[PDB]
Design a protein around this ligand. Structure first.
Ligand SMILES: [Pt+2]
Length: 129
């Protein structure tokens, strides 16, 4: 599923990401834009052999099991394929564990390099929330 910007902002808000660990909704929408282009089916291989999955590109190195990432963890206790659903519940629940682990949203390379320190409120402009 390719979400629209405001449809994803609404789903993320419903699921309790607005100001989760002090990250405004616009941070999460910006991160999804530059990680997945708002596409729940996005998958990308990392140099280390791990893969990133779904609308928030959650990494099989730590967070999910994809059956092909040796010596990795599954800290969200899910198959990585769960993260590709049109329903973002599993991605949001796992993202909440990730951002709580001490590094905050710096875990998302695209957030750090493209969203951090920018006017992220722009990502939710015009949306009925
Ligand atoms: Pt939820």
């Amino acid at each position: 599923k390719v979400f629209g910007r405001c449809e994803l902002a609404a789903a993320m808000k419903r699921h309790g990401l607005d100001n989760y660990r002090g990250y405004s909704l616009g941070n999460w929408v910006c991160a999804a834009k530059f990680e997945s282009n708002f596409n729940t089916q996005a998958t990308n291989r990392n140099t280390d052999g791990s893969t990133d999955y779904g609308i928030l590109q959650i990494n099989s190195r730590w967070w999910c099991n994809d059956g092909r990432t040796p010596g990795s963890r599954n800290l969200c206790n899910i198959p990585c394929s769960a993260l590709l659903s049109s329903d973002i519940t599993a991605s949001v629940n796992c993202a909440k564990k990730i951002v709580s682990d001490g590094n905050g949203m710096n875990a998302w390379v695209a957030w750090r390099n493209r969203c951090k320190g920018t006017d992220v409120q722009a990502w939710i402009r015009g949306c009925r929330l």
